[PDB]
Structure 1
Amino acid sequence: HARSTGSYSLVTQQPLGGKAQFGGQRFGEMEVWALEAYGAAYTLQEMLTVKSDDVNGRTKMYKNIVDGNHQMEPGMPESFNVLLKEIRSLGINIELEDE
């Protein structure tokens, strides 16, 4: 199996095969530890932000990939944002401080 950019899940935006075109491989916690043991932060950030959970980051990246510019403008992963809303839906006020 192989995938570059396929379909995406509605609830949380994450790679999901809907066409029999398969969803991406699952990057687990142990793999994250593997990237953590290596000094590679950017590989990890792009792994769990732009390549996967960032709804803006994925397209904003794709345009750069085709433009011939390798960068990332990560933003915030949609999962943690959903978790912000889920926590904040309770009597719990969660805020992002400073600047």
Structure 2
Amino acid sequence: KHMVDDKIHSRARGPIQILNRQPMEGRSRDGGLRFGEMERDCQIAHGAAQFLRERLFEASDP
């Protein structure tokens, strides 16, 4: 039952939550993907400060 059509997901300036003006959760709500802490740690290692800033501030909840 694990097909790709039921798993494919994309988002670009979609809806956001009410409490925090951040993207929703889930394909059903056109939610965004979670740029978790482990990802932050990875980009910290890359020294990519602009990417880490764009992902945690400009692409999530400016």
Give TM class, smaller chain: 0.7 to 0.9
1:50 aligned to 2:55? no
What is the distance in 1 between the residues matched to 2:27 and 2:47? 37
Give me the TM-score of the superposition, normalised by structure 2: 0.76
Alignment size in residue pairs = 54
Q: Which runs of 5+ in 1 are unaligned?
A: 55-99
Q: From the superposition, tell whether residues 19 and 28 of structure 1 become closer, same or farther in structure 2 (CA, over 3 Å).
A: closer
Q: Which runs of 4+ in 1 moved over 6 A?
A: none
More strand by percentage = 1
**Partners of 1:8 and 1:14 within 8 A in 2:** yes
**Partners of 2:26 and 2:32 within 8 A in 1:** no
1:16 aligned to 2:24? yes
- Identity within the alignment, %: 43
Question: Which residue identity lines up with residue 54 of structure 2 in the other structure?
Answer: E
Q: Which has the higher contact order (CA 8 A, sep 6+)?
A: 2
**Partners of 1:7 and 1:17 within 8 A in 2:** no
Cα RMSD (Å) of the superposition?
1.9
